A paper describes a structure:
Far upstream element (FUSE) binding protein 1 (FUBP1 or FBP1) is a multifunctional single-stranded DNA- (ssDNA) and RNA-binding protein, which acts as a master regulator of diverse cellular processes including transcription, mRNA stability and translation as well as RNA splicing. Central to its single-stranded nucleic acid (ssNA) interacting function of human FUBP1 is a tandem of four K homology (KH) motifs, namely KH1, KH2, KH3 and KH4, which is embedded in the middle region in between the self-regulatory and transactivation domains at the N- and C- termini, respectively. Comparison of the four structures showed that they all adopted an evolutionarily conserved eukaryotic KH-domain architecture, consisting of a three-stranded β-sheet packed on one side by three helices. A common property in recognition of up to four nucleotides is facilitated by a ‘minimal KH motif’ that constructs an ssNA hydrophobic binding cleft formed on one side by two short consecutive helices (α1 and α2) and the GXXG-motif-containing connecting loop and on the other side by the domain’s β-sheet and the variable loop that links the β2 and β3.
In contrast to the upper part of the binding pocket, considerable variations of the amino acid compositions within α1 and the β2-β3 connecting loop led to the remarkably distinct properties of the nucleotide binding pocket at the lower half, which is responsible for interacting with ssDNA nucleobases. For instance, a longer loop together with the presence of small hydrophobic (A194 and A197) or polar residues (T385 and T388) in α1 of KH2 and 4, respectively, resulted in relatively open binding surface with strong positively-charged electrostatic potentials. In contrast, the migration patterns of KH2 and KH4 were rather ambiguous with some slight shifts observed for nearly all nucleotides, except fragment 4 and 10 that had a high GC-rich content. Interestingly, the potential interactions of KH2 and 4 with ssDNA 5–8, which shared the presence of a triple-repeated deoxythymidine (TTT), was consistent with the previous suggestion on the preference of FUBP1 for T-enriched sequence. In addition, we observed interestingly also that KH2 preferred the T-rich fragment 7 over the TGTG-core fragment 8, which was in contrast to KH4 that showed no preference for both ssDNA. As expected, in contrast to the wild type, all mutants did not show a shift in migration on native gels upon incubation with the selected ssDNA. These overall results suggested therefore that all four KH motifs of FUBP1 interacted with c-Myc FUSE ssDNA independently and individually, and KH1 and 3 might exert potential preference for ‘TTTGTGTT’ sequence while KH2 and KH4 might have broader binding specificity.
Numbering used by the authors: 184 to 222, 231 to 256
The structure:
Amino acid sequence: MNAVQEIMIPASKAGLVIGKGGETIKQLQERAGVKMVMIADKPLRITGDPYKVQQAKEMVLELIR
């Protein structure tokens, strides 16, 4: 069954996660093999295979650092 994990994204970083046209969040979904959607700091909801969600969490946190 899918894991669901939320990363809180500061408002100032939201555009960076999504990117122009959504091209950054599309790349992130392809590279990590999960679904990511946004829900003040905004939750990014990551859904997928439990192993892929853990890696995707690290990839997103590293990007927004």
